[PDB]
Short mmCIF file of C-alpha atoms in Angstrom, two decimals:
data_model
loop_
_atom_site.label_atom_id
_atom_site.label_comp_id
_atom_site.label_asym_id
_atom_site.label_seq_id
_atom_site.Cartn_x
_atom_site.Cartn_y
_atom_site.Cartn_z
CA UNK A 1 111.37 104.09 95.69
CA UNK A 2 110.91 102.30 92.36
CA UNK A 3 107.95 100.16 94.07
CA UNK A 4 107.24 99.20 90.54
CA UNK A 5 110.47 97.34 90.25
CA UNK A 6 111.02 95.89 93.66
CA UNK A 7 107.61 94.45 95.26
CA UNK A 8 105.22 95.71 92.79
CA UNK A 9 107.29 94.22 90.04
CA UNK A 10 104.37 91.73 88.39
CA UNK A 11 106.49 88.60 88.50
CA UNK A 12 106.08 84.94 89.21
CA UNK A 13 106.92 82.11 91.78
CA UNK A 14 110.11 81.82 89.99
CA UNK A 15 111.50 83.16 86.83
CA UNK A 16 112.32 86.01 84.92
CA UNK A 17 110.94 89.44 83.76
CA UNK A 18 112.26 91.89 81.08
CA UNK A 19 110.35 94.78 82.77
CA UNK A 20 111.90 94.62 86.28
CA UNK A 21 115.34 93.61 84.52
CA UNK A 22 115.47 96.68 82.35
CA UNK A 23 114.45 99.17 85.18
CA UNK A 24 117.24 97.57 87.35
CA UNK A 25 119.58 98.44 84.67
CA UNK A 26 118.49 102.09 84.98
CA UNK A 27 118.42 101.85 88.72
CA UNK A 28 122.05 100.64 88.66
CA UNK A 29 121.23 97.24 90.78
CA UNK A 30 122.36 95.03 87.62
CA UNK A 31 119.27 93.58 86.55
CA UNK A 32 116.43 91.19 87.67
CA UNK A 33 115.26 87.82 88.78
CA UNK A 34 111.66 86.53 89.98
CA UNK A 35 111.29 84.80 93.29
CA UNK A 36 109.27 84.00 95.52
CA UNK A 37 106.42 85.74 93.78
CA UNK A 38 107.88 89.05 93.01
CA UNK A 39 110.81 90.59 90.91
CA UNK A 40 113.97 91.32 92.98
CA UNK A 41 117.09 92.64 91.72
CA UNK A 42 120.91 93.34 92.86
#
Protein backbone atom coordinates (compact mmCIF):
# COMPACT_ATOMS: atom_id res chain seq x y z
CA UNK A 1 0.00 0.00 0.00
CA UNK A 2 1.79 3.13 1.38
CA UNK A 3 -1.11 5.30 0.06
CA UNK A 4 0.17 7.92 2.55
CA UNK A 5 3.45 8.06 0.48
CA UNK A 6 2.01 7.70 -3.09
CA UNK A 7 -1.35 9.52 -3.56
CA UNK A 8 -2.21 10.82 -0.05
CA UNK A 9 1.39 12.15 0.06
CA UNK A 10 0.57 15.77 1.09
CA UNK A 11 2.69 17.56 -1.66
CA UNK A 12 2.39 20.59 -4.02
CA UNK A 13 1.97 21.53 -7.75
CA UNK A 14 5.72 20.83 -8.02
CA UNK A 15 8.49 20.54 -5.43
CA UNK A 16 9.99 18.23 -2.82
CA UNK A 17 8.78 16.96 0.56
CA UNK A 18 10.91 15.19 3.22
CA UNK A 19 8.00 12.97 4.45
CA UNK A 20 7.38 11.03 1.18
CA UNK A 21 11.17 11.17 0.50
CA UNK A 22 12.10 9.31 3.73
CA UNK A 23 9.07 6.96 3.46
CA UNK A 24 10.25 6.08 -0.09
CA UNK A 25 13.81 5.26 1.14
CA UNK A 26 12.18 2.68 3.48
CA UNK A 27 9.82 1.42 0.72
CA UNK A 28 13.02 0.91 -1.34
CA UNK A 29 11.83 3.07 -4.31
CA UNK A 30 14.76 5.52 -3.83
CA UNK A 31 13.16 8.82 -2.78
CA UNK A 32 10.38 11.28 -3.66
CA UNK A 33 9.54 14.39 -5.72
CA UNK A 34 6.31 16.50 -5.91
CA UNK A 35 4.25 16.83 -9.18
CA UNK A 36 1.43 17.50 -10.37
CA UNK A 37 -0.19 17.99 -6.88
CA UNK A 38 1.12 14.84 -5.06
CA UNK A 39 4.48 13.24 -4.11
CA UNK A 40 5.54 10.37 -6.39
CA UNK A 41 8.61 8.11 -6.03
CA UNK A 42 10.76 5.64 -8.03
